[PDB]
Design a protein around this ligand. Structure first.
Ligand SMILES: NC(=O)c1ccc[n+]([C@@H]2O[C@H](COP(=O)([O-])OP(=O)(O)OC[C@H]3O[C@@H](n4cnc5c(N)ncnc54)[C@H](O)[C@@H]3O)[C@@H](O)[C@H]2O)c1
Lengths: 312, 312
């Protein structure tokens, strides 16, 4: 099976391509693509690592050469926030490239699962959906917003706080991928019970994790490595399910039953064709219930903004 | 165990910290250091990955807080080469950085094992030694020049050629870490046989693998991801050995018996005190015999340079 990374030259893309080179299954194929002229050399550098994963790099305006026969297309192209900005600012910046990149996909590998990393996810996914719809090949079970970073961050904070082994904690995270739209279902963390203030303090910390990294890098980029690792966990999950592994569950922003919004991140059962079943968000706590409602308007706005950009 | 990465904000440094954060044994501590102000931000980014490895970053002029208690110190600091340059050409821009870093290691954690990644390793390892000898704390079982990257490139090219599974091949490589001092013992590869010609092409390819990447990145930088992977393997081998594991063997550049030069790279058994035993380079073919000879001049020359730089 072939995986294609769009935006492989940036900080997130390189960390991701490194992880995938070293962790995809023997026999997999990985093609990298980016406008950056360094791109082909990023592949040559990775080609030197001794794993049964064939790698190739392409530069240019045409991504087409690395989308041929692609099964999974991970999109991390774009740019990221510096100190001050939010996640609803570089909009025209990236939305454009997402728009462009999603188009080449539709023409070249419509039936592949597409994972969107480029922020702001809430909006960029909607834009990709509209482009896929417009081109007449949209498969709503094959378009996901990679929100995995919010999951691994919540795992880490819950572990440290409660003194648990970090690999043994998995917290479900629902909603969206930015600020208020990010909701940790802490009431559902087995074996651990929290106090209202911990839930409050933790939720805040989890929602502001990205800012924590920006202020620390003092305007030297945002999270790139952990983002890389997370995108890496998600790509492998997608790849495992596509190969028939059963029981693969990941929360991800997708087009659902519209119960809360056209797009919403909830627990997903993945299978040979992408989303196999959209799990329920389960029983919420008063706090989660409270928080779930107050972010709605914000979420559909992002979605809105996304739809607009394409249809007009 | 505590691992200190010096020069952590560069491309090698960051790819290396990413791999070590997810791969060191639970319980380990990872310290990052670079003069670049972004460094502490890099650690915070990595601190978001849920593994039981505590990580912190430090910036500034003084590496002291990074070095307190380190058991392993990896030095990837310094400038990489530009298209056209050679590994020898980096001596001037890197000698002082190495000198400064190693002195702080000497004052703060003299017992730690030191891995010099900074090129030209043939020369920078010699500088480090003299510096340690002058601080009066040099342990030749504790100072190594990381050449692991020549190994993994060798296992890759050999596998692609002979149709073997990359993970099953281990070609040993001795000499030094440069265009003509890198000698792969293709004759000792258990299982495969090569033709006069094959050995000829493979050998050149392995020796210029570094340039292959610099050229391919067209000025963007040299091997950084394959290099981060190689230094990670080496660092994992060292740590497993410091912990008591047996049978740990890695080729590295160190002060040996002197049979070929003050420093030479050969198979080394690693143990709880650093280099445990330097294994014999074994059986050489006609060709390998020629190579080994052809290069000694350059090597002693390369070492001579690092020495007078500290002495003179
Ligand atoms: N052993 C090998 O196989 C091998 C392979 C490639 C490169 N290298 C060498 O490793 C070094 C690293 O290259 P790179 O690709 O990461 O380059 P890079 O330019 O991308 O990063 C180098 C980093 O060194 C840091 N640095 C410089 N002086 C410092 C000091 N005094 N204290 C702390 N940090 C300092 C810089 O801030 C920078 O982040 C170079 O000397 C390169 O030639 C080794």
């Amino acid at each position: 099976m072939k995986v294609a990374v769009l935006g492989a030259a940036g900080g997130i893309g390189q960390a991701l391509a490194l992880l995938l080179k070293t962790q995809l299954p023997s026999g997999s194929e990985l093609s990298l693509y980016d406008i950056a002229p360094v791109t082909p050399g990023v592949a040559v550098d990775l080609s030197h690592i001794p794993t049964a994963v064939k790698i190739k790099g392409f530069s240019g305006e045409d991504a087409t050469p690395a989308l041929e026969g692609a099964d999974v297309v991970l999109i991390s192209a774009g740019v990221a926030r510096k100190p001050g900005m939010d996640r609803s600012d570089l909009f025209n910046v990236n939305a454009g490239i997402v728009k462009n990149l999603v188009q080449q996909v539709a023409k070249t590998c419509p039936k592949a699962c597409i994972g969107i990393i480029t922020n702001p996810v809430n909006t960029t996914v909607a834009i990709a959906a509209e482009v896929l719809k417009k081109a007449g090949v949209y498969d709503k079970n094959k378009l996901f917003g990679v929100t995995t970073l919010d999951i691994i961050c919540s795992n880490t904070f819950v572990a440290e706080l409660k003194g648990k082994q970090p690999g043994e904690v998995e917290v479900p995270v629902i909603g969206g991928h930015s600020g208020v739209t990010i909701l940790p279902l802490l009431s559902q963390v087995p074996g651990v019970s929290f106090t209202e203030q911990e839930v409050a303090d933790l939720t805040k910390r989890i929602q502001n994790a990205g800012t924590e990294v920006v202020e620390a890098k003092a305007g030297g980029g945002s999270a790139t490595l952990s983002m890389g690792q997370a995108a890496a966990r998600f790509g492998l999950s997608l790849v495992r399910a596509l190969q028939g592994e059963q029981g693969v569950v990941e929360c991800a922003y997708v087009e659902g039953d519209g119960q809360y919004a056209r797009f919403f991140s909830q627990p997903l059962l993945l299978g040979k064709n992408g989303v196999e079943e959209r799990k329920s968000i389960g029983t919420l706590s008063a706090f989660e219930q409270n928080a779930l409602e107050g972010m709605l308007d914000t979420l559909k706005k992002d979605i809105a903004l996304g739809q607009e950009f394409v249809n007009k």
